[PDB]
Amino acid sequence: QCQDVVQDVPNVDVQMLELYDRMSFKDIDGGVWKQGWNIKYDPLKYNAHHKLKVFVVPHSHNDPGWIQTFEEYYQHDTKHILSNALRHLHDNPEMKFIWAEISYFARFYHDLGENKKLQMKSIVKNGQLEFVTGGWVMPDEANSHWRNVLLQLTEGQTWLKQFMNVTPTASWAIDPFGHSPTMPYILQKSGFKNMLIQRTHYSVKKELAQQRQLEFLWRQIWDNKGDTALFTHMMPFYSYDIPHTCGPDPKVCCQFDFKRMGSFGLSCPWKVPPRTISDQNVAARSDLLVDQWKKKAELYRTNVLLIPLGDDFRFKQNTEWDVQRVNYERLFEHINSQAHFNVQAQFGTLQEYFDAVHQAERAGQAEFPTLSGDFFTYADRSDNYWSGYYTSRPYHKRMDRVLMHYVRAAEMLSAWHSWDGMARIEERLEQARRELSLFQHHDGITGTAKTHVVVDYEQRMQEALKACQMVMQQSVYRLLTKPSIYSPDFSFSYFTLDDSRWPGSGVEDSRTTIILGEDILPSKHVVMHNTLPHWREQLVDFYVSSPFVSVTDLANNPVEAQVSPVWSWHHDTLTKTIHPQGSTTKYRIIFKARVPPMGLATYVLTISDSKPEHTSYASNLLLRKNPTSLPLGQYPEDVKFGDPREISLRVGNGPTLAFSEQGLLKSIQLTQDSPHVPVHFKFLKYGVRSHGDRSGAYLFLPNGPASPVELGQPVVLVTKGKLESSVSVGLPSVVHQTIMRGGAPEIRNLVDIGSLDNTEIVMRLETHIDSGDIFYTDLNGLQFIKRRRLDKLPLQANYYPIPSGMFIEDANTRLTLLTGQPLGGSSLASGELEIMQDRRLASDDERGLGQGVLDNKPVLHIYRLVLEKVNNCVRPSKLHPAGYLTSAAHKASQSLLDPLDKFIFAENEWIGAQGQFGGDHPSAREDLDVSVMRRLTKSSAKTQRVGYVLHRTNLMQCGTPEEHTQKLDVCHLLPNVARCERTTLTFLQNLEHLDGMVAPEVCPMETAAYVSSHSS
Ligand SMILES: *[C@@H]1O[C@H](CO)[C@@H](O)[C@H](O)[C@H]1NC(C)=O
Ligand SMILES: O[C@@H]1[C@H](O)C[S@@+]2CCCC[C@@H]12
């Protein structure tokens, strides 16, 4: 029924971890093809019965922000390229052009008059202008979450279907810095038939070219059957520019980039400029170019050859369109008319190329290899590994994950109703989706844009967060107010959001204190939202003006709560310590919220004059030599002081954690009877090389293994409470906090690298787990892939993306670190895990950015740390390329990426308030998520439609019976259902009309989309 994703190792032609194990990686000079070899061909391979069919595919790589902002590029470059594309294609019917970035195409199209819109649709209809991929952007594939990869794909393709009436089935990804199999996973479930990639390690390109394995059916690592497989073309050479696209010799290919003769600035660095093609030289030029094409064709299996023709922000000047087009037309005319070449060459599009390849395949002329695995970590040359951008600009990496969740919550909360146009819900959600989609660009989330461009992306994401807040709080007001009493002003703030972890404590003082008093306002309603489709309990905290506060639920049942001081840390440059101060004016109340699946739950905070019956107070202990007092206003318990010492803590039934005298974890004891397992946090720094190649925003080029941060005698703050305890320490550049609520701890790091030029700060965990050279990291928050540390590769090559988690295990024990933000990381030695916190780099790394990374700001990084016995778990065999999380680790990841949302009622009194929403929603099996809920129609449509994306992970069976559980049928979540369809993941094509209007659940590791239709 469902394929087993654990126990059957797929049999594939190329399995990338296996290939890595066997391959050499020596960087030897291949000749004119620097990283390959001198390609030879048999001139008699091609003849009158067997011609080489060559498709020259004009293109223009438009970065939505990099050296300039989106809007600066649009004004200076892209509006011209697209205006001239329209003119030239229209006037030249055989000319073709491919277009990837829909964010720019949409920006342009809505500035066009109707006549030009009509002309534009005509060049799309007739195939001359062809969209490739059709995403809002060409996303990063390392740091991006799969949910946002799908978001930005859907944003661009919904635009194309509405305005152009097209949906691309061929994808073009020429610039992301290394490639992820999450792309064919999403694309193949979104109707795609083919895809193309470019930036893979030069040794891999050489290895696959030698075997003609550059075109392959790329399946997921756990896919035994092959149903996930998507035909993929990997380009063979160092760049997608013209010098590295016509064949192996860039000195020759540069002469066929006709923008490089002088009048455009540009030139050929190999010293031979292009010449205008004339009757006098066409035969000689043709002979040179065809010889390049024939050599490139030797690396592939069919007689159909792809020759991209383009570069960054190309096809801008009218004169550039003419000079490319006319010169190639003369080449084509001569080549195609000379039989001795046995070539037929023409401008083509990407789809035209793939269609012709598969016609060749179907004719029996080639069969393709199967492949699984990924293409990280990329190197473009020598030891230049692009692992730096797994961490660059980590404030915005964390902001990506915050905005991902607020997009989801805002679309889901507002989906339950149709809204009047005057509410502007659709407006706000479209802006939020588009600013988040823009940030998925491979210069956005990657942290590889110029300083002012990163500022542009940040301001855009702040506006998106505000839009999501506006929508969420209007929605909560409606969902929780008796229908006959509900009286909305759509511009008013009924609730403010309270978020404990963004921008985070010591990043921005942004949270509102709930002000209560016996003489003023005795109580306050707070509301929690749970986006996940199962009942959820989680501790939530709020700031309040009195410690004397108790909590009740909708039915006035008392709820156990804990009050703690509000602690902030300060780099005290009188005493030269980093140390905490307690607030004397506000306090934190903490309690367990229990919230329906995809639902809401309301609680009340009420002040009293003295300690309430159901509220406890944390003790606090400051460990430092030479202490001074720490007053806390009305807080009832005096802080205690002690010299630095080892301490140990236990919340609830959960683990016991032991801490060193510098306030870092040293051990974890799972059960009262079990061993204290050594687990040691440590902070270290990497430097930059003085001589030769420098780290910058892309490249990680450390000057040797990391050295320990010298900690001195740090101040340690210990807070012990019934519900929540912690240990926090002020270390140089990092306030490090371990938080305990009774299961796996939460780690928070407030990271301020300050003015530490040329430093990368890393957090390492040291254990006795005998992991050897193996470790696991995730790809896009979707799947965990086995990594093997290789000593044949330098340190920076053994760094991988950690977009949401990493783990190490042996026969008996696993340690999993789950993240709230994508960062770079590795396991550099047996029993270790490490993940980079921030990097500040005073040199440029010579990729075109023209600056280092000197714009660091304080960022709050969050994690969960899960130590587990796994000898009872059913794991994949030794040769399997995947790993899987346990239930606890998967729940821990969900607690970071999609926590409960908190709302504080903004006025004194909420008339018509209700206690709960969604108590009748089905509570689905823990491995199932409703990744997206989105209403797809505006309020005037007779037939309302709501789309759902359902994702089932695969969790290890470790012998918890864990039973129960209602079937989730998303099609019956809203009333008056009339149809239920399974669709592509973008919602743009119906794939199956479903019996009884019931949406089935999906298999482990599968993602499906459903659209329910409702008469209204
Ligand atoms: C939309 O797509 C297809 C093109 O193959 C066509 O059948 C349909 O008429 C199109 N609608 C138009 C022309 O807007
Ligand atoms: O970040 C840039 C940008 O996306 C265009 S491309 C230019 C070379 C360096 C990597 C890529």
Ligand SMILES: [Zn+2]
């Ligand atoms: Zn780019």
